[PDB]
């Protein structure tokens with residue numbers, strides 16, 4: 001079985017950990033415990049092929065911004081997460097994209113744009129706006145809810161497919 | 167193309183039983199082991215000039231799975247019945263292991279050796295004469311081994327292979 | 334490159350040398366540590382250059398074999414308390430002229446050494462509390478020290494995590510599933526809901542037997558903590574104290590196997606016994622479908638036991654397609670579980686692994702590798718041995734994450750929780766009984782086969798193992 005190194009990045013509080021734990025444990029985390037650096041493994045069959053996913057769950061808080069290079073070097077693919085009710089988290093996306101490109105020195109890094117918390121009615125980032133950005137990056141855009149599981153497997157397994165075809 | 171012997175190690179848990187097969191298969195000259203890789207329980211050896219292949223089943227650690235005993239034992243043609251010389255209970259267990267092997271193999275004459283293992287520097291509670299007597303009453307060889315120095319380890323496995331060849 | 338504090342005031346600034354650390358030849362792009370002093374292990378556990386969360390799990394899972402919990406806390410507090418450098422010459426000159434110093438080196442050291450190391454010390458504390466809380470459960474003073482340390486960390490940079498970890502500790506002291514699709518309907522056969530008194534091997538639906546055992550066996554699998562495994566404590570004198578979840582799980586497996594054997598040899602009538610064995614193989618089939626490998630081996634072990642394996646007249650009448658199902662399951666265990674290991678690694682979870690080979694591999698890893706390596710007169714902790722153990726506990730944990738999408742049936746669950754085939758009898762006498770029963774119902778050659786009266790008053794025909802589905 002092939003091993004895939006996935007990394008989840010994005011501003012603090014957008015739900016990177018909740019997305020990851022929903023995927024790993026089928027459980028919604030209600031608490032907001034800021035991450036420093038966590039690691040998860042998941043054996044899963046995707047498109048009839050058995051994979052081992054290593055998922056690095058990263059810190060969104062700005063106080064940890066100087067420690068990103070090290071995890072971007074190892075990552076094969078990145079989930080770039082914002083919250084659809086948080087415009088600033090959407091604006092932070094481009095900084096993650098550019099840093100990943102810089103660190104890996106490549107224009108061709110497997111990536112998925114994720115708009116999380118799509119279960120909430122009070123949206124402030126419109127899908128079209130996020131879709132336009134995703135197209136400009138050449139990557140898919142998937143809306144998710146770590147709470148209901150909507151789009152969660154789709155987001156992670158799409159990233160796996162992009163690493164596969166890379 | 168050489169003969170392959172299926173050897174099965176049995177005996178009480180928690181008293182250094184696994185050291186015997188590990189010391190045999192081990193590098194020799196380097197204290198290391200990865201039980202996870204194949205070739206960690208298979209070994210080509212020359213015994214009395216005849217080359218053969220030893221396949222050793224040691225399920226050390228699974229003793230509490232007591233209803234799996236029969237299925238593990240079924241796989242073997244020869245058996246090492248191991249007790250610790252500082253653990254009288256493990257010695258008293260031997261009789262039931264032997265009875266169980268006989269039943270599974272449906273035979274009163276199963277190639278086996280009795281092995282008294284010294285697994286640490288604690289005081290011996292089973293004298294070698296007791297174990298000799300027990301082995302004689304069974305009509306099987308007795309071998310004492312050390313879990314640290316590799317003494318007696320080859321003798322235990324080679325003797326069992328002779329018991330098989332001469333069955 | 335950054336200058337470090339003197340090793341005289343901060344021990345974790347000692348240069349790497351083969352006297353205090355040894356690396357594996359193979360990278361991955363971070364170094365792999367073969368051996369080191371505790372000081373060097375803890376420095377790399379909280380290294381300023383890179384993160385390695387897997388090292389944290391590995392260290393926290395296995396450290397107790399070379400370092401006491403109280404000592405670990407002292408060492409990481411010591412790691413946390415990093416001296417800042419004094420102003421440089423350029424800073425000095427600026428200060429002497431009444432100007433604000435640039436403090437370029439101080440700021441770089443804070444940003445690139447102090448804050449990553451302190452954050453990673455906090456990450457060890459976080460992981461320690463969340464995933465290895467038993468150290469604190471078993472030692473309240475250690476917990477008091479942790480609370481004090483965390484609670485008195487100052488500075489705006491660590492504040493978010495310090496406040497978080499304080500809350501996490503408090504929660505842990507006083508201490509759910511979403512799918513995806515709904516679970517299939519509970520299946521019933523001769524025994525109807527609520528009629529627990531009629532529950533039995535042939536009266537429950539074989540599908541629902543496999544499902545409820547898989548739920549039970551999954552819960553038992555999922556409850557085993559690494560603390561029940563490291564140090565091989567499940568094999569030692571205090572195993573009931575240190576490994577109660579592992580041993581409950583193993584004892585369930587043993588009791589189910591013995592129950593299958595008992596159901597078979599206490600059915601003296603050949604035709605009825607054939608029905609009993611065939612039903613058990615159907616339950617095996619559903620176990621395979623559910624990836625319940627523990628359940629699969631429960632059946633296989635029972636079919637290979639001395640009382641059952643010798644029942645040639647029974648085996649003869651088993652449909653050829655069930656023989657193949659049984660033989661295929663048996664072949665999983667052949668050649669040291671070669672096909673089992675390949676199948677486990679290829680299926681889509683949830684599954685229930687067979688725990689037995691994990692125990693054997695952990696025991697042998699620990700027994701066959703030295704605690705320390707001796708190098709240039711020094712004793713170094715053999716950390717590759719600990720990594721090998723943690724790879725096994727890590728794999729165990731990986732299969733503990735995925736829950737089964739199956740509905741609990743409380744009465745059937747209870748029926749199997751309370752299964753007690755041995756009654757008040759000791760193992761040897763119960764086991765001798767099973768074999769004598771076997772001899773009775775199918776005597777050795779050349780004794781001819783006796784006949785026996787039937788015992789079941791309800792129909793023997795199986796409802797099969799394909800699930801049904803009303804609107």
Ligand SMILES: Nc1nc2c(ncn2[C@@H]2O[C@H](COP(=O)(O)OP(=O)(O)NP(=O)(O)O)[C@@H](O)[C@H]2O)c(=O)[nH]1
Pocket residue numbers: 010011012013014015016017018019029030031032033034035036058059060061116117118119120144145146147148
């Ligand atoms: N309604 C809703 N709440 C969500 C969702 N995802 C996360 N949350 C909530 O938002 C908060 C932040 O979640 P968290 O996963 O900790 O975010 P994070 O991005 O990992 N934070 P950090 O960067 O500091 O680690 C939590 O209270 C969580 O329950 C979602 O899809 N829907």
Ligand SMILES: Fc1ccc(Nc2c3c(nc4ccc(Cl)cc24)CCCC3)cc1Cl
Pocket residue numbers: 610633636637641642643644645647648649651656659660663
């Ligand atoms: F009803 C039974 C009674 C007893 C058995 N024992 C077995 C026998 C044989 N091969 C086996 C293979 C594997 C398992 Cl596990 C058991 C086996 C061939 C010889 C005959 C008995 C099997 C059934 Cl089905």
Ligand SMILES: [Mg+2]
Pocket residue numbers: 016017018033034035057058059060
């Ligand atoms: Mg997080």
